[PDB]
């Protein structure tokens, strides 16, 4: 499905599809595994995210409740089309730091 990589210096790298299936794996390998090593100024860019559902939105939203917990601030970049469509709904616009 998709993968997560390129941590410890922000610049979090996201792969293709974020659906209901690839959700928990991406969260687990990103939440504690990746976001604990991170230092600061965290940027995640959904450049190579070609298809996504609201599970992806909640993934990016689950990426913020721990960076905020870990103090260091994060922002999202390269918001893909479909993700924006679901983010152009309720509490996913100005809430999402981009």
């Amino acid at each position: 499905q998709a993968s997560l990589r390129e941590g410890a210096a922000g610049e979090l790298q996201l792969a293709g599809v974020l659906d209901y299936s690839s959700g928990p794996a991406l969260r687990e390998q990103g939440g504690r595994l990746i976001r604990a090593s991170q230092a600061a100024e965290l940027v995640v860019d959904c450049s190579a995210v070609e298809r996504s559902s609201s599970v992806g939105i909640s993934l990016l939203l689950a990426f913020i409740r721990d960076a905020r917990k870990a103090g260091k601030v994060l922002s999202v970049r390269a918001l893909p089309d479909d993700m924006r469509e679901i983010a152009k709904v309720s509490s996913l616009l100005e809430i999402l730091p981009l």
Binding site: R27, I57, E85
Partner: protein
């Protein structure tokens, strides 16, 4: 190209032949509306949702057909559509949060904090974010339908059909705005199935008419407005008398009144 197609579709309920060789072609990405009481439009919904097995014929939904799939794959297909049944059809034993979360806890094993985010952002989209606390009978009639619309749009289906805006203006307005926003924003196929012709045509883009077992024509709301089909011009307007009889089959206003 087409989300739902009914190739030679017909349905029999106790040797009554509800439908007979109908052929509807639902275009994806567009709000299509199949308005019609007897037409049993609500029964048709089940067919294209495979809650009811057709008599003979196949329903091509998002590619493969439904009645010719394994149960372990029919269930896997169920993720593609949600249903916004009239009166909410809300699980009474579950609160609004678990109500909206129910489609998630079924097809998906997500962390109970991730399910909460989707339920929270899904309930806020319909405006019913504050009532994540209540029970479906503690909710007003119109507000109950909004939470159901949120339960449906959970899992992000690609098509969604809302059988019966009805019996409620300000509420009906938010609902008719949401069924269009969810379509243009999410790019999901909407199948609005209500008798209220006005608002249907208002949001519909390719509206159908189902009558006495057969699809009585179809088209864009204006091309269907003056199709000159006596039944369809009688439906699309008020016109109390027409092909559907205004009077019941009485015997005689002269005889029965005097004899």
């Amino acid at each position: 190209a087409y989300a739902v197609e009914l190739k030679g579709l017909t349905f029999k309920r106790g040797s009554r032949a509800i439908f007979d060789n109908i052929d509807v072609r639902i275009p994806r990405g567009k709000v299509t509306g199949i308005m019609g009481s007897g037409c049993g439009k609500t029964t048709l919904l089940r067919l294209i949702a495979s809650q009811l097995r057709p008599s003979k014929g196949e329903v091509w939904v998002n590619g493969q057909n439904l009645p010719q799939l394994s149960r372990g794959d029919l269930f896997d297909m169920r993720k593609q559509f949600g249903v916004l049944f009239q009166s909410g059809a809300l699980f009474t034993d579950l609160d609004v949060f678990e109500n909206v979360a129910f489609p998630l806890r079924v097809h998906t094993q997500l962390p109970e904090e991730m399910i909460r985010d989707i339920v929270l952002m899904k309930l806020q989209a319909v405006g019913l974010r504050g009532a994540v606390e209540l029970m479906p009978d503690e909710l007003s009639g119109g507000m109950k339908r909004r939470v159901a619309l949120a339960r449906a749009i959970a899992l992000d289906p690609q098509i969604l059909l809302y059988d019966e805006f009805v019996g409620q203006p300000i509420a009906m307005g938010v609902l008719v705005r949401l069924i269009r926003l969810l379509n243009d924003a999410l790019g999901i196929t909407s199948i609005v199935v209500s008798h209220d012709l006005a608002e249907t045509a208002s949001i519909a883009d390719y509206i159908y008419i189902v009558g006495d077992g057969r699809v009585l024509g179809h088209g864009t709301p204006d091309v269907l407005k003056e199709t000159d089909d006596p039944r369809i011009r009688q439906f699309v307007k008020g016109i109390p008398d027409g092909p559907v009889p205004f009077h019941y089959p009485a015997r005689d206003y002269r005889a029965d009144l005097l004899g």
